[PDB]
Specification:
The structure is cut from a larger assembly and holds 2 copies of chain A (206 residues).
Chain A lengths: L1 H9 L7 E7 L2 E6 L3 E5 L22 E4 L9 E4 L2 H4 L1 H4 L8 H25 L14 E3 L5 E4 L7 E2 L1 H13 L3 E4 L5 E6 L4 H10 L2
The complex binds flavin-adenine dinucleotide.
């Protein structure tokens, strides 16, 4: 609040008189005593934790609502659960949302997060690797690194090509091979900084 | 017996009058009428089953006795068990056996066996893979090929290099990878003709 008020003070805008705020096209819009003042987002310092955030569209909500992707005066509605489906009784909904506009904001937020994580890695600052729990098969070892379990293939049969692919990915991330008593490859010693990239690489290979 | 008798008849020897036989340095020695006759073993047909034999020195006996590697009028004595050690009480034994003379015949016999198995392979003749039981970790599959179980390493840890070596040997012999519920690599589909060569290769890699 103090940062936004101080920023408004720079443009000679009294916060106590503002009619409405808005954030559109990467700019903050202020409506006070008549016309709307345009302030670039770059010029306002965001809450620090927002730099560590990955979730643009509230992907876990029953229903998510925003302005991006839909005409002005309308709200974008993303229905995700049967509870969220009840909004169809309350609102006359239309199709035609601009899906690519929403995805662009997903990527910009993720790139902001990647820059902040890289900066913490370079500066020896603390990182909580909270997104490892986004993925199945990830466990935390006693020493603060992670193991990644590749779900056992039926009857423990692996093609030579498949096994070689697993070893190549393990080598790339300095992982160590452990064979479980259910016939799975489990790769140990993965840095929290590498877990997401390695899992996606494994998923890409099937 | 009939083959030896007819062979001797060709050299004008009546087997009934023979005083002693000997096999030394590639020859059949025949002592008859106070004479020594030498017949190259190459001119004599051996019993068919000997071509499929691997064991020159009776390697499973309590004590094995022969003439190779010791001076004329002595017997070579290879003691292998505590039962065999009792011969030390019956015989004043001497050291100095020519071990290479014995090894030379081990390898000649093995090479003869390899030639006959290869001949049978080429002719699609019946081979009994009786020597697969010389090695641990070898099992017979339902379809007449074999699996080779690599004894699980402690806690199922394998170096990337170790796993790659196993896969390379599996590939060479057209083997298929199965991971056991004790953390072992088990290689399936190995021909009886290849089992020994493959096991020795794995043993060579440690
Ligand atoms: C901080 C912030 C950033 C946003 N950024 C974007 C964006 O980048 N892109 C985008 O498309 N939309 C964004 N929105 C959402 C958008 O501004 C609207 O809130 C949304 O479209 C709903 O509009 P509405 O007219 O349907 O809701 P309304 O009927 O106006 O109701 C708004 C609801 O928002 C809730 N609310 C308001 N402020 C907050 C807050 N600080 N914390 C929690 N709840 C709050 C109120 O409780 C209210 O129920 C943002 C909203 C906020 C609060």
């Amino acid at each position: 609040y103090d940062e936004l008020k101080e920023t408004l003070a720079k443009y000679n805008i009294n916060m106590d008189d503002v009619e409405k705020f808005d954030i559109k096209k990467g700019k903050l819009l202020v409506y006070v005593n008549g016309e709307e003042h345009k302030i670039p987002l770059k010029e306002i310092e965001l809450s620090a934790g927002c730099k560590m955030c990955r979730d643009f569209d509230a992907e876990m909500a029953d229903v998510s609502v925003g302005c991006v992707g839909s005409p002005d005066g309308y709200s974008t509605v993303i229905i995700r659960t049967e509870k969220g489906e009840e909004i169809k009784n309350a609102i006359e909904l239309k199709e035609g949302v601009n899906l690519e506009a929403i995805e662009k904001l997903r990527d910009l937020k993720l790139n902001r997060f990647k820059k902040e994580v890289e900066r913490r890695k370079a500066e020896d600052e603390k990182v909580s690797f909270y997104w490892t729990a986004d993925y199945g098969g990830v466990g935390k070892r006693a020493d603060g690194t992670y193991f990644i379990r590749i779900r056992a293939k039926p009857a423990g049969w692996y093609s030579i090509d498949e096994a070689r692919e697993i070893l190549e990915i393990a080598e790339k991330y300095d992982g160590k091979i452990k064979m479980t008593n259910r016939g799975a490859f489990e790769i140990h010693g993965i840095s929290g900084f590498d877990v997401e990239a390695m899992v996606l690489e494994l998923m890409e290979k099937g």
